[PDB]
Amino acid sequence: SSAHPETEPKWWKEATFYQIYPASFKDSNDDGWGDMKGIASKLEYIKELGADAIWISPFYDSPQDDMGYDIANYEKVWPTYGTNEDCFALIEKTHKLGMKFITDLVINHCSSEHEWFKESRSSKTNPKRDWFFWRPPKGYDAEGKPIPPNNWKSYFGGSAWTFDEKTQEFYLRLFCSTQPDLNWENEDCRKAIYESAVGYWLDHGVDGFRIDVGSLYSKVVGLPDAPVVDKNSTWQSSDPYTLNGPRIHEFHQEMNQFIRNRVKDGREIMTVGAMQHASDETKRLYTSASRHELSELFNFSHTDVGTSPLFRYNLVPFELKDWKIALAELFRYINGTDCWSTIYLENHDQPRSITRFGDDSPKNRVISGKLLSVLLSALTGTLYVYQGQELGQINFKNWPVEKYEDVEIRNNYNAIKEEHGENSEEMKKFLEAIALISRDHARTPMQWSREEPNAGFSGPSAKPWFYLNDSFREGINVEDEIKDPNSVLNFWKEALKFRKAHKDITVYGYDFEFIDLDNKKLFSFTKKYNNKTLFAALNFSSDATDFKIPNDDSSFKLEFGNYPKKEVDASSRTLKPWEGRIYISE
Numbered sequence: 001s002s003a004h005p006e007t008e009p010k011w012w013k014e015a016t017f018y019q020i021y022p023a024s025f026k027d028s029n030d031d032g033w034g035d036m037k038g039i040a041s042k043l044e045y046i047k048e049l050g051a052d053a054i055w056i057s058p059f060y061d062s063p064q065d066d067m068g069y070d071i072a073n074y075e076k077v078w079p080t081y082g083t084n085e086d087c088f089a090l091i092e093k094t095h096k097l098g099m100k101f102i103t104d105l106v107i108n109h110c111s112s113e114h115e116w117f118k119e120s121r122s123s124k125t126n127p128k129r130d131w132f133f134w135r136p137p138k139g140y141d142a143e144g145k146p147i148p149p150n151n152w153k154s155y156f157g158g159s160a161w162t163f164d165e166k167t168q169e170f171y172l173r174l175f176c177s178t179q180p181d182l183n184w185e186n187e188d189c190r191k192a193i194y195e196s197a198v199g200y201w202l203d204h205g206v207d208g209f210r211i212d213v214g215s216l217y218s219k220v221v222g223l224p225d226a227p228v229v230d231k232n233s234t235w236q237s238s239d240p241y242t243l244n245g246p247r248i249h250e251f252h253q254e255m256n257q258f259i260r261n262r263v264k265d266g267r268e269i270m271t272v273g274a275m276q277h278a279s280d281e282t283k284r285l286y287t288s289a290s291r292h293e294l295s296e297l298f299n300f301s302h303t304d305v306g307t308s309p310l311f312r313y314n315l316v317p318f319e320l321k322d323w324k325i326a327l328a329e330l331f332r333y334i335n336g337t338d339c340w341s342t343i344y345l346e347n348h349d350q351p352r353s354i355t356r357f358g359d360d361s362p363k364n365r366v367i368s369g370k371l372l373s374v375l376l377s378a379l380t381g382t383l384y385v386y387q388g389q390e391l392g393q394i395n396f397k398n399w400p401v402e403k404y405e406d407v408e409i410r411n412n413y414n415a416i417k418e419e420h421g422e423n424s425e426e427m428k429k430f431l432e433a434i435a436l437i438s439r440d441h442a443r444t445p446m447q448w449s450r451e452e453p454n455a456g457f458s459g460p461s462a463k464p465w466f467y468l469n470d471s472f473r474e475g476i477n478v479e480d481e482i483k484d485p486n487s488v489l490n491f492w493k494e495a496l497k498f499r500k501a502h503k504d505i506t507v508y509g510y511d512f513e514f515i516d517l518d519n520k521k522l523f524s525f526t527k528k529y530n531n532k533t534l535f536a537a538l539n540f541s542s543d544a545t546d547f548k549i550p551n552d553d554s555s556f557k558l559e560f561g562n563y564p565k566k567e568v569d570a571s572s573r574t575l576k577p578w579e580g581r582i583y584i585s586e
């Protein structure tokens with residue numbers, strides 16, 4: 001491990017994070033929206049699961065056009081969630097339970113309701129005009145409508161620009177129309193961003209930040225038209241000119257130094273960047289400890305599988321090997337470096353992992369949920385568990401499109417309708433994809449009980465902000481799973497116990513090697529830590545599947561798996577349907 005600087009222990013390397021989506025976690029006052037007192041009331045549940053830290057998605061004052069990722073005030077909690085004091089009490093309670101607290105840092109853009117933007121948009125001459133990207137129309141079209149400055153597509157569909165009638169110019173918004181991008185080329189803007197979004201929260205005791213689209217802050221000068229890579233779309237990906245831009249490392253170094261200089265008590269702050277995609281070299285420039293940029297990053301290749309590189313909401317075939325390789329992209333690059341990785345399958349933007357990568361049928365949802373837990377338990381990096389994942393939550397089924405809340409659904413739907421028609425092949429493909437891929441599969445209220453109609457998320461008379469998944473009725477809920485020794489929840493508790501007990505090779509293991517990479521069913525690998533070898537054999541299939549241990553001997557002991565403990569033959573070399581096993585040799 002001397003040749004593996006990545007094995008140097010840090011609290012944030014070996015912490016298991018639990019991600020909370022505040023709108024959907026726990027409602028304490030029957031208004032149908034989750035809130036801070038609701039979260040506080042369930043911290044003991046999170047601690048008992050085996051979490052070491054929490055990350056709460058944005059709870060700052062926000063119109064909710066993008067459910068909190070459109071921030072009107074970095075220094076004020078959204079009143080529906082609580083007061084600033086409620087948040088501080090929540091951070092303290094988290095801390096007194098022995099857990100760390102990270103907050104979501106959303107500074108690529110703010111709400112158009114933010115005072116900075118209200119000032120910026122007021123005139124062409126005010127001191128905050130250049131805190132955003134304002135450009136005149138390219139010209140006007142034959143119908144008299146202004147033409148946007150370039151052809152860039154919003155992440156949620158349609159143009160990435162919004163016309164302002166008052167000043168007769170467009171402003172850039174890569175996200176929804178009320179999320180204007182902040183201009184990081186303006187130094188006064190950067191400094192104000194740091195004071196408000198970063199310094200305020202450091203002053204109030206956060207242990208770190210999850211950094212939202214951290215790879216988008218640097219725009220290529222001129223904001224040029226993007227190449228036409230999609231010939232069936234008016235608007236084109238801005239990625240070449242917005243993703244990992246020329247100043248992105250300069251910006252992250254400056255922000256890292258701001259944090260180091262603002263912390264008052266010498267505590268160690270973790271930053272995890274939601275960086276989307278980056279070559280391994282770029283990842284190393286971000287996460288190498290000696291670069292003083294990020295602690296670690298999320299890379300989305302593993303959650304991209306089965307979706308068109310041209311459009312998230314067009315499904316394409318994938319095979320197990322594609323997902324194996326994509327998962328390995330999170331962590332192989334850190335081998336023999338001072339970098340660090342993340343490990344996760346779910347978050348507030350993703351559908352449920354059982355539905356995507358296991359088998360969500362009544363027959364197999366439990367065992368395949370446990371398989372995914374076995375897999376995640378064994379991988380190197382900071383592990384993240386998303387609310388409901390520990391219950392084996394699955395996608396909702398058979399929802400009409402109008403039932404979806406997500407702005408990403410609404411905007412993409414309207415873009416397709418405008419470009420192709422509601423009754424088009426393009427629309428049919430979109431509707432097929434949302435049933436599998438929508439962010440809303442992550443966003444239905446947390447299922448605490450089998451109580452009708454709100455599953456313990458709120459009182460029985462409350463109207464939840466968003467519809468409940470019917471799965472609560474089928475026993476996917478905290479109350480039912482605690483009592484069931486065979487539940488996915490109880491399994492996750494054991495998986496986190498196993499991971500911690502063997503953390504040297506589970507969290508800090510290196511020299512990862514695939515075994516039988518091409519196998520369409522078997523996901524198998526080895527890792528090392530000094531004299532120890534970990535071997536995983538994981539059967540992502542309803543078929544039984546053979547495996548081999550490289551250099552097989554009697555030294556490989558079965559240490560963890562998802563089939564009943566007393567019924568597994570460790571010496572056998574065939575996995576039952578959806579069976580996973582971790583062996584360790586020392």
Ligand SMILES: OC[C@H]1O[C@H](OC[C@H]2O[C@H](O)[C@H](O)[C@@H](O)[C@@H]2O)[C@H](O)[C@@H](O)[C@@H]1O
Nearest residue numbers: 066069106155175212213312348349408
């Ligand atoms: O703050 C806007 C937006 O940023 C983050 O996600 C960016 C993008 O990431 C992936 O590509 C997903 O598939 C997209 O749906 C996301 O828009 C936040 O995580 C996201 O919640 C937010 O809306």
Ligand SMILES: [Ca+2]
Nearest residue numbers: 027029033035
């Ligand atoms: Ca509430």
